[PDB]
Amino acid sequence: KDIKPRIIRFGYGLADDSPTGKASAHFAEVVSKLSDGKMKVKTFGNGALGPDEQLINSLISGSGEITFVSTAPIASLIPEFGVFDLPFLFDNEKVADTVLDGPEGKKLLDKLPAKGLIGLNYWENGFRNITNSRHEISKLDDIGGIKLRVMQNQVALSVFKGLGANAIPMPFTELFTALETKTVDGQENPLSTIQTSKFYEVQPYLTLSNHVYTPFVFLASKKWFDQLSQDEKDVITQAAADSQAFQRKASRQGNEDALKYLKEHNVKVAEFSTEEREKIREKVAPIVESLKAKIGKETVEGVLDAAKKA
Ligand SMILES: O=C(O)C(=O)C[C@H](O)[C@H](O)CO
């Protein structure tokens, strides 16, 4: 009804042909359809508008309208978001969907407006897997001394240092070059990102560790969103609901497709045995306990309880 022409900028870090990049184009299509072509979303993928930290700041200030980012960089504004960098929180994607779409996920999204952001909903980045260029990693012992890029918060740094890595926080947009030049030995990310950001080309080793699950938050600038009419807000939130469903499906198919592609493209795949997984859990347990104070005890306990019920 009350919809005026709008042009809406949507930058992101992943490649345009990643599952989430394709979901961003899907969001653009749905926004156009629901607005009779009046609201036009322009996507800028592959880091064209900067990494997550810059995208977040652009939404706060108003130079950008929409983005998706990992939860990890949000921890520098809202420490409770660091909960998702704890290892082995979610047994599988069904547990993740339930927790994130339920009250514990909502409690965290509800903290965003005070920082100038609207958490429209959660999208799936996914289960993270270790890659490197030094040696196969199939044992906890093999992590020792690996120079491993991590996401930029205290939880990620502390977890990987606790596992023996030389952990190097770096923005995602600098990662391919750091791997290619061997400024770092490795990194960790979902399979479809390892594929579509081309990290595999410079990472002969992959471990199916699935050690952490990363949500994306699908974000709007609060300053911008608040100036929309209710009908315009409804286009955005309806398109966000449609796109979340599309994105999670595309992500899960993308993960299966990525493992097949990586094996065909000269990547050597390992895993941690059940005994090595046990060693990792035992090693990180005291680190996780100490990190509760930095994240927020009630957030950690609430998320763990929600995951158990799920
Ligand atoms: O920083 C990482 O490794 C991530 O998993 C991805 C980033 O959030 C990326 O900017 C998403 O577009």
Close Cβ partners of 259 (under 8 Å, ≥ 6 residues apart): 191, 208, 269
β-strand partners of 7: 40
* Ligand 1 atom at shortest distance from the alpha carbon of 13: 12
Residue 11 to residue 47: CA distance in whole angstroms: 7
Pocket test for ligand 1, best of 10, 12, 14 (most atoms within 8 A of CB): 14
Q: Which domain holds residue 233?
A: 1-310
Q: How was this structure determined?
A: X-ray
The total number of structural domains in the chain stands at 1
The strands making up 268-270's β-sheet, listed across from edge to edge, are: 166-169, 147-150, 186-189, 129-132, 205-207, 268-270
Nearest CA to ligand 1 atom 12: 13
Tokens of 66: 């929409």
Question: Does 197 carry a binding-site annotation?
Answer: no
Pocket test for ligand 1, best of 81, 151, 216 (most atoms within 8 A of CB): 151
From the CB of 197, is ligand 1 less than 6 Å away? Answer: no
Question: Does 77 carry a binding-site annotation?
Answer: no
Question: Does 13 carry a binding-site annotation?
Answer: yes
Closest C-alpha to 92, from 123, 125, 126: 126
Does residue 18 come out as left (phi exceeding 0), alpha (psi in the -120 to 50 range) or beta?
Answer: beta
Nearest CA to ligand 1 atom 11: 13
DSSP state, residue 5: -
* Ligand 1 atom at shortest distance from the alpha carbon of 152: 1
DSSP state, residue 17: T
If you measure from the C-alpha of residue 93 to the centroid of ligand 1, how many angstroms do you get, rounded to a whole number?
Answer: 18
Resolution in A: 1.3
Packing angle, helices 19-34 and 230-264, rounded to 10: 150
Strands 268-270 and 205-207: parallel
Write the DSSP assignment of 35-99 as a string of letters.
TTT-EEEEEE-TTTT--HHHHHHHHHHTS--EEEEESGGGGGT-GGGGGGGSTT--SSHHHHHHH
